[PDB]
Each structure stands twice: as structure tokens, then as C-alpha cells.
């Protein structure tokens, strides 16, 4: 009897949202539907373009029901407030959306409440101004959740999906696979934070005050994550955005997506995560996440930069290019904070910088560098990461690099942190080595036959080449 | 130093309406004066304009209904960071 999607987000051990308010920006809604009656406040904010009734409020009503619906909702308690920015054809404007977001911020300033979650179940093309408004609203301390988009395309080409600091959600089906419908389907790529159920999702139907309908889309997926976030923020109201994102990643089902569904180049970039509620089992734990930069592009001196959130520490830095035409990476300070920078090679199509960003309070972390010597440097403190860059066209708390490369060790004073190094090598397109259960991968690199790059996938270090050895640095409390 | 942007997805563009985004620290009073200034300068050139909204609280700036002909002029106004042509968003 439990809808498949609500079972899917139920953790393997289990036992809301009322302190939290969820704002919805959408079509008009049927606020008297019995799923949501008394739970949604209609603001009567409206900013919509001219067209060009059951249908007028179908989309919004269903999503309000996914978030908070008494029978089929994720966060059955939760209070919602709705703004109308989509017309009867489901069409809105970037300007109308901006005015809506501004309205939410003004409401908050005038009558402050607790944590706010804003669900943006909509998409247009990449918009500088829409992304900036989302970022500013996120920085003001509001949580934003958006749909990845339904075009079976790179979510970085769409807004608010592409917007920095917003939680962007793709859709998976009952078989935990990315939704595809012909040439259409869930968007993907490095701007997607995670996936959630978004096919055949039962919820309130505005056809009649007690009716239900199954709908599909990345908004339905985004609505699951908005609900999960509302519950998480009710339990732990002081979470920063970075703490909330790390929990969402951490409590997700991992490696359940067949990445064959995605276009080849997007496989490495797309997180293999399906959202789930936190378990009843939960003491401090080390949370880390992998942050891919935008591609540097092909300029000879191009650099890609991957950054962590202000309250996170960069524990390691790796890089990847598909050609293997690469000058590696280094950790450099910037506004008094370490970032991961990767360098393109001459004639390279470009590279990605890949940060490992972790929640480590009381950490004092530094970088120890040695210029080309093979070349070696150690934390003379625990080693959490090795990086190496070179300026040439081609070739024990210790990092070792190529004799012609500079080598960089990330060293942290973090008492109460235990770390170990696990190695694995083989004859090979890809070699792989995973940390043990209960340990957190902090760093991933290849021993110095021609490697494309290295990157952490959850707690597994992956090395890609054209006698390769993957090296994982793993830590725990 | 002010730049112009419009939607790469051509069918989703909505020409004739522009979001004028001012520099981060711009004050509401400055946004209002800048909007009035655009309208006056436009009017001297024979153009009708309409200020649909003045933004403050997240981004400073304004929404203006005008011909794109005026964009070179608008990009030279004080406080302008960039201008974006309005475009469509859709239920997902």
C-alpha cells in the first residue's frame, strides 16, 4: 500500500518539518484539496505571462502533495506557502521568478520564522541573473531545491538547475534508473547534486478534492528532496547549507544507478546517489564530498578551480582530462582559504579540478610543497591528500611524485582523526580501491601507465589510464 | 564594463523586456534614480519605456519594458553591472 517512492526513501532502519516552512513557486494550487487543506497557505503573490482550471492548478497541487500531503507526502506535517509564477500552460518568466524569490526574502525580513526551504520546480535556459538571485538567497541562509530539468541534457545548461549553492535534483524510476522517455528524461551531469524518485509518483490531483494522480518529472524528484530537507532541518535546525548537503549525500543510496544510461562523458561527472531519509541510528563523524569544477576549456594556460563551502576544509585535490593532456593540480590559497586548481596542457582540450571538501571543525590544515627533485614531501599532523603539478609538456604521511613534477601534501592537525593509506595496482582502463566501512575517503591519487586522472567516488578512489596503482587516504574519528 | 546577456535557447527568449542588474552595493534610492534616468534619456530619443519593477533585497536593479535599441545607452548608466533579456521558465 505504501507508494513505491515513499518506501524507496525509507532507510534500512527507521522509527515532520513543522519548525520549517517550505515555499513553493509554481502554478496556482487547489489549496482545499484534502491532501493539503490547512497545510498550504496561498500567498496570492502572482507574476505570470499571458497564456499563448483543473489544468491550471494540476502541477502545483501535485507537488504540494508530494512535499506535505497527509497520505502520500514526504514531510506529512510540513507548512507550505505558495507563490504563483507559472500560468495555466505551466509557463513563467525569469523576471517573475526573480520577483517571487525577492518576495520570499522580504516576507522573511518582515516576519522571521525558522529554517526556510524553497522549492523551484521549474527550469529555463542558463540565466546569469536567475543564478545570481538564487546564490544571494542561499547566502542569506535560505535553502533552495530545484529540478534538474527534463531534457535528457546537461543540467549546467539550465537555470536554476546550474545555480551555485542550490540543491539540484534529478529523477530516478522504480528500478533506481535515471528516467528516460524517448529523447526526453532526467537531466544529468555535474550540476546535479543527487537523484530522487520522479516517475510514477502518486499525489494530490486537482481534478477533484479527494482525487490522486501519478505524475513524473524532475520537480517530483525535487519535491522528495525538499521534504527530506524539511525533516532534516526540523531535527537539526542549526544545519548550514554545507552540513545539510553533506547529510543528503551521506544518507543517499549509493551506486544503485547504472551509469550506462548517461552519455559517456557525463558518467564521471554525475553523482550516483538516490535520496533517502536519515535512519534512526542517527556522535561526530567525518563527512566528505567530491566537488567537480567546470571544465577549464582548451586555452594553453587554462585552469579549473573547485572550491569548498566556507565551513568546509579542502582535504585533497585531484584532476581529470579525457585526453590525458594534463599538467596536474595544486592547492592554492584564495581569500585565506584553500581551493583546488588544475592545469591544462598545451594542446589539451581542457581539464577538471576535483576537490574533496569535508566537515572538519578544529582542523588546522596546511600544504607542504616540494618543487621538482623521484620527488617527495611529507607532513613533518595527518596526511589527508597528495597532489602534483608539472610545467613540462611530458614526462608514511608522505606524498611521492614524478621527478619533474612539484608535489603537494595536505597536512591537517586534527586530533581524534585516524588515517590510513590503502593501495591497489593492476596491469587497464580503470583501477579502483575503496576505504573500509566506517572510514571516509579524504584523498585519491595514482602512484607515478599514462593516467587520465583520479577522483573519489563516494569512498572509492578511481584512477583512469590509457602497472597503475590507485592510492586512497582514508580517515575516521 | 557592463555586459549584455540573453537566452541561448532562442525560442525561449522574450525580447522587449530587460532586467537591468546594478552593482552589488547599489542602494534602492540609486536604483530608482537610475531607472528614471533611463526613462528620461530614452524619452529624449523618442522611445517609450515602462519600469515594471524595482528590485531590492537580493539584487539591486529594475525590470524595464523597452526596445532593445536602447541597450547600448542602458549599459552606460551609472551602477550597471549587466543587463539580461527576459526569458521563459517552465514547469518541470
Amino acid at each position: 500500500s505504501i507508494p513505491w517512492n515513499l518506501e524507496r526513501i525509507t532507510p534500512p532502519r527507521y522509527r515532520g518539518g513543522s519548525l520549517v516552512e517550505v515555499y513553493l513557486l509554481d502554478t496556482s494550487i487547489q489549496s482545499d484539496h484534502r491532501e493539503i487543506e490547512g497545510r498550504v497557505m496561498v500567498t496570492d503573490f502572482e507574476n505570470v505571462p499571458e497564456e499563448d482550471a483543473s489544468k491550471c492548478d494540476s502541477h502545483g497541487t501535485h507537488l504540494a502533495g508530494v512535499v506535505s500531503g497527509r497520505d502520500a507526502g514526504v514531510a506529512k506535517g510540513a507548512s507550505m506557502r505558495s507563490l504563483r509564477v507559472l500560468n495555466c500552460q505551466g509557463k513563467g518568466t525569469v523576471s517573475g521568478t526573480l520577483i517571487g524569490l525577492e518576495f520570499i526574502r522580504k516576507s522573511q525580513l518582515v516576519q522571521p520564522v525558522g529554517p526556510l526551504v524553497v522549492l523551484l520546480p521549474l527550469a529555463g535556459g542558463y540565466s546569469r541573473v536567475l543564478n545570481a538571485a538564487c546564490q544571494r538567497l542561499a547566502r542569506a541562509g535560505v535553502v533552495l531545491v530545484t529540478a534538474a530539468g527534463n531534457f535528457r541534457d546537461d543540467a549546467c545548461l539550465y537555470s536554476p538547475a546550474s545555480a551555485p549553492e542550490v540543491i539540484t535534483v534529478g529523477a530516478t524510476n522504480a528500478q533506481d534508473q535515471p528516467v528516460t522517455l524517448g529523447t526526453l528524461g532526467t537531466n544529468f551531469g555535474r550540476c546535479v547534486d543527487l537523484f530522487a524518485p520522479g516517475e510514477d509518483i502518486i499525489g494530490a490531483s486537482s481534478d477533484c478534492s479527494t482525487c490522486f494522480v501519478s505524475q513524473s518529472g524532475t520537480s517530483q524528484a525535487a519535491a522528495h528532496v525538499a521534504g527530506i530537507a524539511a525533516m532534516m532541518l526540523s531535527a537539526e535546525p542549526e544545519l548550514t547549507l554545507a552540513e545539510l548537503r553533506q547529510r543528503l549525500i551521506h544518507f543517499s543510496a549509493k551506486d544503485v544507478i547504472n551509469e550506462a544510461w548517461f552519455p559517456e562523458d557525463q558518467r564521471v561527472l554525475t553523482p550516483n546517489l538516490v535520496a533517502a531519509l536519515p535512519p534512526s541510528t542517527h556522535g561526530w563523524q567525518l563527512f566528505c564530498r567530491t566537488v567537480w569544477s567546470a571544465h577549464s576549456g582548451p586555452t594553453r594556460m587554462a585552469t579549473a578551480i573547485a572550491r569548498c563551502a566556507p565551513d568546509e576544509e579542502l582535504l585533497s585535490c585531484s584532476s581529470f582530462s579525457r585526453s590525458g593532456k594534463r599538467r596536474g593540480e595544486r592547492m592554492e590559497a584564495q581569500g585565506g582559504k584553500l581551493v583546488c586548481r588544475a592545469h591544462n596542457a598545451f594542446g589539451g582540450e581542457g581539464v577538471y579540478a576535483i576537490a574533496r571538501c569535508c566537515l572538519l571543525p578544529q582542523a588546522n590544515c596546511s600544504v607542504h610543497t616540494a618543487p621538482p627533485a623521484g620527488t617527495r614531501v611529507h607532513c613533518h599532523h595527518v596526511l589527508t591528500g597528495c597532489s602534483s603539478h608539472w610545467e613540462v609538456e611530458d614526462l608514511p604521511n608522505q606524498c611521492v611524485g614524478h621527478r619533474e613534477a612539484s608535489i603537494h601534501a595536505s597536512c591537517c592537525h586534527a586530533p581524534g582523526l585516524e588515517c590510513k593509506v590503502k593501495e591497489h595496482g593492476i596491469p587497464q582502463e580503470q583501477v579502483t580501491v575503496a576505504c573500509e566501512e566506517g572510514w571516509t575517503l579524504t584523498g585519491c591519487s595514482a602512484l607515478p601507465s599514462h593516467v587520465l586522472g583520479a577522483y573519489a567516488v563516494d569512498n572509492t578512489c578511481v584512477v583512469r589510464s590509457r602497472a597503475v596503482t590507485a592510492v586512497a587516504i582514508c580517515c575516521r574519528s | 564594463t557592463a555586459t549584455f546577456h540573453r537566452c541561448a535557447k532562442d525560442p525561449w527568449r522574450l525580447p522587449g523586456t530587460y532586467v537591468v542588474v546594478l552593482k552589488e552595493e547599489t542602494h534602492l534610492s540609486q536604483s530608482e534614480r537610475t531607472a528614471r534616468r533611463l526613462q528620461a534619456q530614452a524619452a529624449r530619443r523618442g522611445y517609450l519605456t515602462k519600469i515594471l519593477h524595482v528590485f531590492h533585497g537580493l539584487l539591486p536593479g529594475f525590470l524595464v519594458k523597452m526596445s532593445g535599441d536602447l541597450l547600448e545607452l542602458a549599459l552606460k548608466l551609472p551602477h550597471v553591472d549587466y543587463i539580461e533579456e527576459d526569458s521563459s521558465v517552465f514547469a518541470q
Binding site: 502541477h59 527534463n150 531534457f151 522517455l181 513524473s216 520537480s219 | 518541470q92
Partner: peptide, 8 residues
């Protein structure tokens, strides 16, 4: 999929 969901 319903057509209220663009562009399904």
C-alpha cells in the same frame, strides 16, 4: 507523464 509537465 502529463503535458502539464514540460515538455512531456
Amino acid at each position: 507523464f502529463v503535458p502539464t509537465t514540460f515538455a512531456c
